[PDB]
Design a protein around this ligand. Structure first.
Ligand SMILES: [Mg+2]
Ligand SMILES: [Zn+2]
Ligand SMILES: [Zn+2]
Ligand SMILES: [Zn+2]
Lengths: 84, 107, 97, 85, 171, 257, 505, 177
């Protein structure tokens, strides 16, 4: 249904399932020969690269969180607080 | 509220739903002898105004049906005389977290 | 090797959404098929060269889709049609919720 | 478990005669004790399946809304720009 | 009769083109798979307007491959004739069976039998033509037809028309 | 919820905590005589025999008397109290040990030797520091988030049983005379708890249904069968074991016992 | 999957709209006139008759042909053919309802037996749930056994109002075998309910009457529980089995159909020749029998419809029936590729998260990697290394979607890899794997592990990870599945990893 | 394909596809009441030759400009000036657009975005349906009979006399060559 950046309600944190898919999803793309927005300090593993792409929060993705009723809340990996 | 003793004539009862709006109920004596709602296990329910509900829903993105239900003939459903639609707010004690809200629509 | 119900329930428990889809498709059955955007069936006559498509009856050519479902599923669905039952497969939801 | 049994109204058993008759879509119930029977009285009453239940997907080999699949992911082209020196 | 219908479309993109100027490649790929297409449903997709404000929205990553997919909503000018529409165009081909006139991107044929009586066909001519007590219709002459029927075909839409009625013919 | 949309807990486990982060901590508040309870959490700044001996707090002697603090110092007490009652109305058994996120017994043991605190020299905490902080702490152990009442109310609930342990532990009389914490240590202990808690929450995804299921059947499988330890005393025979569990899940009318 | 690109757009299934086949569609969909019951032998000539299985449907003999559709064998879901029945039949499974329905409607004019007028009714006509709004309406009509012509309205029980006519008494009904019999009363009148009639009635049931009863105006009218045109499933459903040439072994299903077909003909031929009036219904039951025993064969009406040799027969239903069958046996649990299994033992020298795989397996299991500048060097290296030296590979694949059997292919040693190609390589130290022991009823029965290629043929694990699997080294076989994507191996790494599992929920 | 802003819930039985004609009955995709991307309601967009010519040009032109913002890092006379614009922003194999531009550029009736303006402002006071306002805008007409015959969807929808005052002021605005 769409939810404004405001009136936001979900967790401010990142569900492990979220991270893991992102991480996976990214690495996949990296190995798909995709642009990598960080200095590979000499990394050759798409995951490892993704993990870096993440600890510098430079991953162009937005998790769209869907709610039982259909409406969703979009959260970027830039925002999402990565504790774990 | 009508309180019979041994029973009512099946010829009689079929006259209650013949004068709306007004509503009628029927309890046996041996029934009311003890107030169940005082029972260790039964926790307090509560009726909710047709607004506190239109809210509960809104605030939970709930479709009427997705809500836990209570039997029209449920002991406590009677003790508070609910109607097809009214919602009750069962508030119990929890070993996980002292209190624990919960709700129940009425089918 | 058999990746059975039990090993299934276990993945679901873990939350490994895709490592599951895999074990089930990309690692076993997996098959592609052409559905009609109208009578949600395995009808459609796919001549994967001249692109020609058709689904006379629900008489199509235009509205056509392609999907990914284990072979078993293709089978099942047919087996059912075999038993006069029609399991329509749609790609867009109309009921909402 | 308990909460599952109750809710509905009274005591919904954990058996073919109970929970597997609920407002849950076909295929999902289809996947337990009554299989063919179920399906029959499904296409009979023109059932319609959400395809929201694990089983629903595992049977169509799709990614089921579950942890990893409890959400969609996307590329914000706008944040994709600001990511280049 | 030409139209401006609002449309959309889906484009699967590879992680490859996931650059800083992705938007670009899209609008591009759009125009590649759009302009010059045909559908008995929409007619001839001729041109995409407002190239600048093409809505891409956010695109979603797929699940097995990182390809993304956006639903690009746009707007273009179209054209799809109708069985009753009166258009005029320039003739192109001609034969013993009647000539073919071209109106817009589409070619509307005309059976020798669907035109007037007093209009015989001349072959010993060059270029070939149809002669009348006072009219003469050959290759370059401009005619005004009355589309009597349409026919959708792969990537085109031909039609049969006439000039038997009144106010129809050469100009 | 389930594949439909039907709720089945408006909060997993009625507390939104993930099983992984929980242990048997004790509710000191419940057990014990009305006598000792006072000798522990009771602080009276207006009394030679019921005030914090300055050998503990830095601003100890310049407190004995302040009437503005005995307003807080008391707001605290009337609470650990209101608590005691609440609990005994829940855990009637008297049982004080329960499964609760954030092990606070340890979180402090760490705070202890991590700053090499010495049981000789006095603290440096304002009594305002303690109470007014432990109060802000709970303000952040958010489990639910909503911007409205309904929810912000359910929050206070899913949090309750915990705080009680919290306050039970972060008692002004406790904090100083029991474990010599310092502004630092304290402020630390508060930091971790806010987190260790926040981490203890459950992740919106976790297929609990199946998890739940598994966890009952696992042990279900190991259950002995048709044993009856009573046999040898017929007439005092009762149905116990797997046949019983069968009986349940089945929702059987004619139960053996 | 399925190889060969297709303009067709790729989507997912969102809804599953179960319905019932209207004879009209059955024909519509159908491509085979399916007249003859024979299989092939165009008088022995090997091929297929434009009769049963392929009068256009799918094929066999490794021949594209499938109505030009070509694509042959793999990449072509059979197509449905039809087979017009001579006289309508019951649907083994639907007999149940077909009956109950009648009990819910009087014949002749075919209409409900309780309008808005009878009050007990209303209370039913409101329950939204076609599943109970039915077993309710029925509970209220199995009793009414007279199509009332007039009933007292909402006013005086003295004034009578009329609705639908004809009160022709309704007959009570009982299920005998596969037919429906009802009685009329004063000394009953027992006559069999001809399908030809039932159908009619149903056909005459109203739109609002459908709906009111658990039905649907578009996908499932009751009139469709009675079979009129039988959909004939194509080959891939009832595949044969060839012992080279001149030796063919067909499928059970193909046989029933045959018998159904045979039976059908022998019936038709009886209505266009010496028709001994009631000597026909003696073979109409045979049709019904086969047309019924084909879908189901485990009924109460004893006759198991055996097939010479005492072999029961495999009813379509018999295939889906749980455990070992279609739904629970092929879908909820599949056998899978990239799986391994051997005896296990204890290694006090591995890390907890590790699992010592023996070389033998590493060299057999392959993780399809993607050729990328990050790897090209190291990758090609393997390729060269062949599929026999450990650190190696055993297939390379080009964008053209084609395999390169590194163990043969003349250009084995050759090959210059390419950005965008893939190299199914050997599992190497540290690849994330899904280790596990059965039976699985614990999250901790399947945990990811760090691979660690080793000698000797036994999977190696760390003692302290014995209990989670609850295994002993008394010859305990364990399994192992290998991830395949990059995202997949990530779901095992970031979620199912042994160390992530140390605290049990 | 290329979806068209309206998801008509097709329930299996797809049979009703009415005819198409000058009974102003155009396919579903072209009712006067169609939906805009923003999600509002908007009248059908009927373009008359020359009116289309301009519209396409406009876009083709302004596309060029934006096509270079990113590169930094008289009858027979228009045929040529255009071919270039195309050999500039078009895909090249858009043979369709080409032929269209000629037709469009040869049969048009208005050069100025101003005369075309008056045309519109004039016709859009007839309340006629877009497809008439279109045909009426790109088809020479002297008598009403001539118009009302070629465009039958009129007939009764407007007195003969008035349609004639409309055709009288069309010939006048009819730009010269
Ligand atoms: Mg053993
Ligand atoms: Zn179709
Ligand atoms: Zn084929
Ligand atoms: Zn009747």
């Amino acid at each position: 249904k769409a939810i404004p950046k405001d009136q936001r309600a979900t967790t401010p944190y990142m569900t492990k399932y979220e991270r893991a898919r992102i991480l996976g999803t990214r690495a996949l793309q990296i190995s798909m020969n995709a642009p990598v927005f960080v200095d590979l300090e000499g990394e050759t593993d798409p995951l490892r690269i993704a993990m870096k792409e993440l600890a510098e929060k430079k991953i162009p993705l937005v998790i769209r969180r869907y709610l039982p009723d259909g409406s969703f809340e979009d959260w970027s990996v830039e925002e999402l607080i990565v504790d774990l | 509220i009508f309180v019979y003793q041994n029973n009512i004539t099946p010829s009689a009862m079929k006259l209650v739903p013949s004068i709306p709006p007004a509503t009628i109920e029927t309890f046996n004596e041996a029934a009311l002898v003890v107030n169940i709602t005082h029972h260790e296990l039964v926790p307090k329910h509560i009726r909710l105004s047709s607004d506190e509900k239109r809210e509960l829903l809104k605030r939970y993105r709930l479709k009427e049906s997705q809500l836990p239900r209570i039997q029209r003939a449920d002991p406590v459903a009677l003790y508070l005389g609910l109607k097809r639609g009214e919602v009750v707010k069962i508030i119990r004690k929890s070993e996980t977290s002292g209190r624990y809200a919960s709700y129940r629509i009425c089918m | 090797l058999r990746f059975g119900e039990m090993e299934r329930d276990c993945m679901i428990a873990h939350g490994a959404a895709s490592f599951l889809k895999e074990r089930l498709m990309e690692a076993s059955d997996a098959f592609r098929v052409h559905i009609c955007g109208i009578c949600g069936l395995m009808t459609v006559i796919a001549k994967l060269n001249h692109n020609q498509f058709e689904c006379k009856g629900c008489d199509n050519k235009i509205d056509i889709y392609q999907i990914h479902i284990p072979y078993a599923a293709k089978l099942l669905f047919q087996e059912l049609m075999a038993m006069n039952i029609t399991p329509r497969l749609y790609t867009d939801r109309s009921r909402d919720f | 478990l308990v909460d599952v049994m109750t809710t509905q109204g009274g005591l919904t058993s954990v058996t073919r005669h109970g929970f597997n008759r609920s407002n849950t879509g076909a295929l999902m119930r289809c996947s337990f004790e009554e299989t063919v029977e179920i399906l029959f009285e499904a296409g009979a009453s023109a059932e319609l399946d959400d395809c929201r239940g694990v089983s629903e997907n595992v049977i169509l080999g799709q990614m089921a809304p579950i942890g990893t699949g409890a959400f969609d992911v996307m590329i914000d082209e706008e944040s994709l720009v600001k990511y280049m020196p | 009769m030409f139209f401006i219908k609002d449309l959309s479309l889906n484009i699967t993109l590879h992680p490859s083109f996931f650059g800083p100027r992705m938007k670009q490649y899209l609008k591009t790929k759009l125009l590649e798979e759009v302009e010059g297409s045909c559908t008995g449903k929409f007619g001839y997709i001729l041109c995409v307007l407002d190239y600048d404000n093409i809505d891409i929205q956010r695109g979603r990553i797929l699940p097995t491959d990182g390809s993304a997919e956006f639903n690009v909503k746009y707007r273009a000018v179209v054209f799809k004739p109708f069985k009753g529409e009166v258009v005029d165009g320039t003739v192109v081909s001609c034969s013993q069976h009647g000539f073919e006139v071209q109106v817009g991107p589409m070619k509307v044929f005309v059976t020798k039998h669907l035109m007037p009586q007093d209009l015989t066909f001349n072959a010993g001519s060059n270029p070939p033509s149809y002669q009348s007590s006072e009219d003469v219709i050959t290759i370059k002459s401009r005619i005004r037809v009355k589309i009597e029927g349409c026919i959708s075909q792969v990537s085109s839409i031909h039609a049969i028309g006439s000039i038997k009625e009144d106010y129809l013919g050469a100009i | 919820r389930n594949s439909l949309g039907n709720v089945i807990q408006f909060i997993y486990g009625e507390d939104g905590m993930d099983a992984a982060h929980i242990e048997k901590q004790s509710l000191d508040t419940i057990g014990g005589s009305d006598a000792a309870f006072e000798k522990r959490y009771r602080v009276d700044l207006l009394n030679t025999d019921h005030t914090l001996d300055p050998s503990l707090l830095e601003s100890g002697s310049e407190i004995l008397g302040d009437l503005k603090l005995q307003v807080l110092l008391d707001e605290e007490y009337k609470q650990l109290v209101k608590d005691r009652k609440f609990l005994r109305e829940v855990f009637v058994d008297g049982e004080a040990n329960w499964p609760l996120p954030v092990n606070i017994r340890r979180i402090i043991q760490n705070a202890q030797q991590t700053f090499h605190i010495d049981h000789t020299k006095p603290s440096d905490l304002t009594i305002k520091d303690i109470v007014l902080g432990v109060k802000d702490l709970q303000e952040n152990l958010l489990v639910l988030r909503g911007k409205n009442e309904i929810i912000q109310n359910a929050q206070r609930d899913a949090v309750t049983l915990f705080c009680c342990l919290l306050r039970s532990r972060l008692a002004t009389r406790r904090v100083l005379q029991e474990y010599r914490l310092t502004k630092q240590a304290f402020d630390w202990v508060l930091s971790n708890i806010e987190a260790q808690f926040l981490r203890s929450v459950v992740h919106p995804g976790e297929m609990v249904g199946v998890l739940a299921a598994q966890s009952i059947g696992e042990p279900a499988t190991q259950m002995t069968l048709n044993t009856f330890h009573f046999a040898g005393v017929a007439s005092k025979k009762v149905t116990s074991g797997v046949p019983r569990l069968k009986e349940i899940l089945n929702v059987a009318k004619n139960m053996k016992t | 999957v399925g190889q060969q690109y297709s303009s067709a757009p790729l989507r997912t299934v969102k809804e599953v709209q179960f319905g019932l086949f209207s004879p009209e569609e059955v024909r519509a969909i159908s491509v085979a006139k399916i007249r003859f019951p024979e299989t092939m032998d165009e008088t022995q000539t090997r091929a297929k008759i434009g009769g049963l299985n392929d009068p256009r449907l799918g094929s066999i003999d490794r021949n594209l042909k499938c109505q030009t559709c070509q694509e042959g064998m793999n990449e072509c879901p059979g197509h449905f053919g039809h087979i017009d029945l001579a006289k309508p039949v019951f649907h083994v499974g639907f007999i149940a309802k077909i009956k109950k329905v009648c009990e819910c409607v009087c014949m002749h004019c075919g209409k409900l037996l309780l309008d808005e007028h009878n009050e007990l009714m209303r209370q039913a006509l409101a329950i939204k749930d076609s599943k109970k709004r039915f077993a309710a309406i029925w509970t209220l009509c199995k009793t009414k056994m007279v199509c009332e012509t007039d009933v007292p309205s909402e006013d005086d029980p003295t004034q009578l109002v009329s609705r639908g006519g004809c009160g022709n008494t309704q007959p009570t009904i009982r299920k005998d075998g596969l037919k429906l019999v009802g009685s009329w009363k004063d000394e009953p009148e027992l006559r069999v309910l001809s399908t030809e009639e039932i159908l009619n009635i149903f056909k005459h049931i109203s739109v609002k009457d459908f709906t009111s009863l658990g039905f649907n105006e578009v996908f499932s009218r009751p009139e469709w529980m009675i079979l009129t045109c039988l959909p004939v499933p194509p080959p891939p459903v009832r595949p044969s089995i060839s012992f080279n040439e001149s030796q063919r072994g067909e499928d059970d299903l193909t046989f029933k159909l045959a018998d159904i077909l045979k039976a059908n003909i022998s019936l038709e031929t009886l209505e266009h020749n010496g028709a001994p009036h009631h000597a026909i219904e003696e073979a109409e039951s045979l049709l019904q029998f086969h047309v019924a025993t084909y879908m189901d064969n485990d009924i109460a009406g004893q006759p198991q419809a055996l097939q010479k040799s005492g072999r029961p027969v495999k009813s379509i239903r018999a295939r889906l029936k749980g455990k070992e069958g279609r739904i629970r046996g092929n879908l909820m649990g599949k056998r899978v590729d990239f799986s391994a299994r051997t005896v296990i033992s204890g290694d006090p020298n591995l890390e907890l998260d590790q699992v010592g795989v023996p070389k033998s397996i590493a060299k057999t299991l392959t993780y399809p990697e993607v050729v990328t500048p990050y790897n090209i060097d190291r990758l090609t290296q393997l390729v060269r290394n062949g599929p026999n030296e450990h650190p190696g590979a055993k297939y390379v694949i080009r964008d053209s979607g084609d395999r390169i059997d590194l163990r043969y292919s003349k250009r084995a040693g050759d090959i210059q890899l390419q950005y965008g190609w893939k190299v199914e390589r050997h599992i190497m130290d540290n690849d994330p794997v899904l280790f596990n022991r059965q039976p699985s009823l614990h999250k901790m029965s399947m945990m990811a592990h760090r691979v660690k290629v080793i000698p000797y043929s036994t999977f190696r694990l760390n003692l302290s990870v014995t209990s989670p699997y609850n295994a002993d080294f008394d010859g305990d076989e364990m399994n192992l599945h290998v991830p395949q994507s990059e995202e997949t191996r990530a779901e095992l790494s970031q979620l199912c990893a042994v160390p992530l599992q140390i605290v049990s929920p | 394909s290329t979806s068209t802003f309206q998801t008509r819930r097709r329930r299996l039985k797809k049979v009703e596809e009415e005819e198409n004609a000058a009974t102003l009955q155009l396919g579903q995709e072209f009712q006067l009441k169609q939906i805009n991307h923003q999600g509002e309601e908007e009248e059908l967009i009927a373009l008359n030759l020359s009116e289309a010519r301009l519209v396409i040009k406009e876009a083709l032109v302004e596309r060029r400009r934006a096509f270079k913002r990113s590169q930094k890092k008289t009858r027979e006379k228009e045929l040529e000036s255009i071919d270039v614009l195309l050999e500039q922003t078009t895909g090249g194999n858009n043979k369709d657009l080409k032929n269209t531009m000629q037709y469009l550029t040869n049969f048009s009736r208005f050069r100025d975005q101003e005369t075309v303006g008056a045309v519109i402002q004039l016709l859009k006071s007839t309340g006629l349906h877009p497809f008439e306002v279109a045909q009426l805008g790109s088809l020479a007409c002297d008598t009403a009979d001539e118009a009302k015959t070629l465009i039958p969807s009129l007939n009764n929808k407007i007195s003969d006399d008035e349609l004639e005052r409309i055709l009288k002021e069309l010939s006048n605005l009819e730009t010269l060559y």
